[PDB]
Design a protein around this ligand. Sequence first.
Ligand code: CA
Ligand code: CA
Ligand code: CA
Ligand code: CA
Ligand code: CA
Ligand code: CA
Ligand code: CA
Ligand code: CA
Ligand code: CA
Ligand code: CA
Ligand code: CA
Lengths: 64, 63, 67, 266, 266, 280, 74
Amino acid sequence: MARENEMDENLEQVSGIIGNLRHMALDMGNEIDTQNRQIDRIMEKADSNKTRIDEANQRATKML
Amino acid sequence: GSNRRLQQTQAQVDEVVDIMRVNVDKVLERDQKLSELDDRADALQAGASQFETSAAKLKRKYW
Amino acid sequence: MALSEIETRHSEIIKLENSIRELHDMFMDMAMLVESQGEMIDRIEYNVEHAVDYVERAVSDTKKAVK
Amino acid sequence: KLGKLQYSLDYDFQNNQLLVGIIQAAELPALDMGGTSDPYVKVFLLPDKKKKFETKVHRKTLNPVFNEQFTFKVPYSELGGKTLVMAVYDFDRFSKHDIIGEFKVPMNTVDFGHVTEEWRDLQSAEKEKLGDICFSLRYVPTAGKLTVVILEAKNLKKSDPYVKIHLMQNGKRLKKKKTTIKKNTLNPYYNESFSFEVPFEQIQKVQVVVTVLDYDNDAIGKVFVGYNSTGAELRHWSDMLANPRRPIAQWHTLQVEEEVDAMLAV
Amino acid sequence: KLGKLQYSLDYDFQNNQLLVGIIQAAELPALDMGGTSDPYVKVFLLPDKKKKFETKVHRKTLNPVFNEQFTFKVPYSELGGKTLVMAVYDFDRFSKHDIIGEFKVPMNTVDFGHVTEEWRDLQSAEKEKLGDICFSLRYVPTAGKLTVVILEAKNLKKSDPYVKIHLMQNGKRLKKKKTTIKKNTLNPYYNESFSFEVPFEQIQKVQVVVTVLDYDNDAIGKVFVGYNSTGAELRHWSDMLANPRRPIAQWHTLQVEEEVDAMLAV
Amino acid sequence: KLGKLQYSLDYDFQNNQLLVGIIQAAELPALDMGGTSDPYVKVFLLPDKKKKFETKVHRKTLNPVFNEQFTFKVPYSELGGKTLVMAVYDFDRFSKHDIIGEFKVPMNTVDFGHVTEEWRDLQSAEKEEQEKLGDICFSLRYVPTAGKLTVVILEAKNLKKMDVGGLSDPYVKIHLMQNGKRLKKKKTTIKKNTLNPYYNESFSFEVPFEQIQKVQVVVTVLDYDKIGKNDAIGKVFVGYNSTGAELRHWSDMLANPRRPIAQWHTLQVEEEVDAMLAVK
Amino acid sequence: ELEEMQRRADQLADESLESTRRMLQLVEESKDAGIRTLVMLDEQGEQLDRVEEGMNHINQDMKEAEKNLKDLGK
Ligand SMILES: [Ca+2]
Ligand SMILES: [Ca+2]
Ligand SMILES: [Ca+2]
Ligand SMILES: [Ca+2]
Ligand SMILES: [Ca+2]
Ligand SMILES: [Ca+2]
Ligand SMILES: [Ca+2]
Ligand SMILES: [Ca+2]
Ligand SMILES: [Ca+2]
Ligand SMILES: [Ca+2]
Ligand SMILES: [Ca+2]
């Protein structure tokens, strides 16, 4: 039964590790969400600035 | 028999698997958004350079 | 106790092992993807910095052109 | 075997918009190293220039469940002239995304009044030959007898195949003949003979058109020999004319009806 | 430049025999001391075990006129599976007769119904490398990115050369990419990059196949690297694996498709 | 140089037990006053924690003959994974008994089927193994331009059991130190009953570049107890006067401005670290 | 036959353990992967922050350039 006990000892270790993995997966998800919101915002600002640069360039060339 | 421990651990693993699948699909979304941002950034720096040249011409003409 | 119970427990264990293997593969895949996307973000940062420089100089020239 | 897609479709007459449901995909082909692909679906309308909608990407699955809905604000009266195109693509991180498969649903064929839901097998994109046809030709100028023996067909698949033959001149169908139907075969054998009467004075001004059909009438494919013909067809015709009383057997690749009819339109 | 041969060909359906005419040769290469060779032609069929026919020898001429005819009594129905081989040899009085050049005409490719007559350029016998290909490989195990940059080709081979690349595993073609076409060159420069996604767990079980083609599809040549690869290819693969993030450029000799496909068949 | 030990080995398949014979030792070194030592032998299975057997003590001999036998009731199937340990000690009446030498015989190398008997030369004993108490993994990041020092406490593993029957409420405390002075104090949340805590908790400090080569960052893992003083499990420090993997970590941090560098560290007893910190 | 059956049972009981070990290896490797992932996500997060700062700077500078061009235009 000793081997069985060893097996039992393992399974519990695995269980705890699975707990940690769960918590990690959750933190991972939260951060990925935050970064996706951020990337969205970045793309909006980037498009805005691109439009501004195009407009300013057109006006600049107009006066040449 | 350790039926409870096994079923519980199994349930935990299943849960974490679901969470991780969700997370992987999310990071794929992130990959798409990042590609789009890469292209946008390239276009942006290009246009910025062109505007720098034009502005240089304006300075040379009016200053 | 009887062979059926031992075999069912064994089967459940193998099931757990397969599930865990799937989880493992998912974590590895996750790390991989995140790394590649890291390279993409490096490029993005690069281009953004160049854009900042160019715009900066341009606005300087416009500043001097209005004087 | 490029997989199947289950989808739903309903027109909201209250809000005056078309609602399309992308439910799930099954048995998708595997092109990724890992053994499974990363499928996602683009949806849109061909008549419309608007950007097509796209579902989320599902990682490592040949059987993804999307369960997503899309809306197109288009009045019913203007809907009949448009078509809906659904295309399943394979996501890739470092290259242009390969298409897995696609399908089209012309809006003008659905009989509205009911919630639509079905499985459709994905069709290939960009390609098609449709098979090959082998037949002999013989012409006897003195007697003015033109003999055509339908020998065999191959690679027919897109069954119960049969073959129809038309004799044509100046855009006019003069004579029509047809073979028997062979059941449940992709490789029918016929050995069936047909004869036409053509005087020598007109033999250089006629066309012989051969069409292969799938019994259900849907065309499998077609080709023509004779006046304004090209390549192996014109060569076959010239070989026939060069050898009075001698039978000349030859294979031909089938061609899409659009092109052949375009060549016949002259 | 091994010269050209003009010949004629006609099947006598009346006597049921193949008639072959050896008309003349032109611009034959000179290997004899005197400056001109002593050409003669052997004709026969490869499927057939019968002794090949031979023309008379013409002394000291690089432009002999044979004007000779040979007959093979073979039924038409049995003719399609045979091929005709014409070989020009150099007569020598004291040694085995050296071959000048040769050519083959598969019987199954001629479209019968007409008297055949043409000039064909003589091809070499017994040899072929087909050129060499230079490309770099890079693999990043952590990110699972495999990068292949097609750099250059040389000595292409037998023009408008282009290069196609296939990624393969277990006899299956998983991904296909292709370069642009360069016109009218035997020495194309490309510098074109392609990337594939391969996880570390499978990197030791994949093959990368690179094929060079001549646009007309005729293969110029091909090779593969990876699993079951040998020599400089296996060495290149191991070098690639040994240096993460480091690009490794290398030349390779092209090999005949038969052998590579035989190695891929496993 | 030490000496040699002669032993015998036999598995009794009838009673399912391992029989071990301690015959004699020879050429034992001599450390006792009389010119000869007072040797005795401990015999045990390494995997097993059971009480070790001992031979009788032989007075004043460098070549004692014990001729004693010991028995281990162990199933045959479980024997292949164990290792037999035999150690010769020097008896002393007024002090801790010095070890004279030891040797190990992995069971998986013995050719069962015949009684084994041989002389094996005694090898020098292993030195004392440190408790360790566990390991901590955290990341370091420094941004010279902003003067931002970021420490992310990620996770700990293999800690020391500090409450009865378990390790509990491990919580991490962070000190910023300079010239023996504690400048700032931070602490993580508390985790209950885990020898493998996950934290993922970030902390930031302001340290100018001109001082970055003169500071220490101290990381301590402690075991909380609602009532009483909280005993430290262990600690480590990086920065000025740091050594080994710690110095390597600090150097990696400095080598990669704005880039976060994660690393594992072995915990050290509080006494030594504090001793190294008290002297500038 | 009986002996055979007991041997089989002992075999299965012997196997399940090894399976649990393999589980331990897999979850450990998984945890390491997770840690790497979190670190990378942190770094890339900081990079994205810097990118946003850049976008703001460009936006502001383009506001000023727009002002100067409108001043030159009127
Ligand atoms: Ca993919
Ligand atoms: Ca893919
Ligand atoms: Ca049909
Ligand atoms: Ca049918
Ligand atoms: Ca000669
Ligand atoms: Ca000669
Ligand atoms: Ca060519
Ligand atoms: Ca060409
Ligand atoms: Ca003593
Ligand atoms: Ca406690
Ligand atoms: Ca305690």
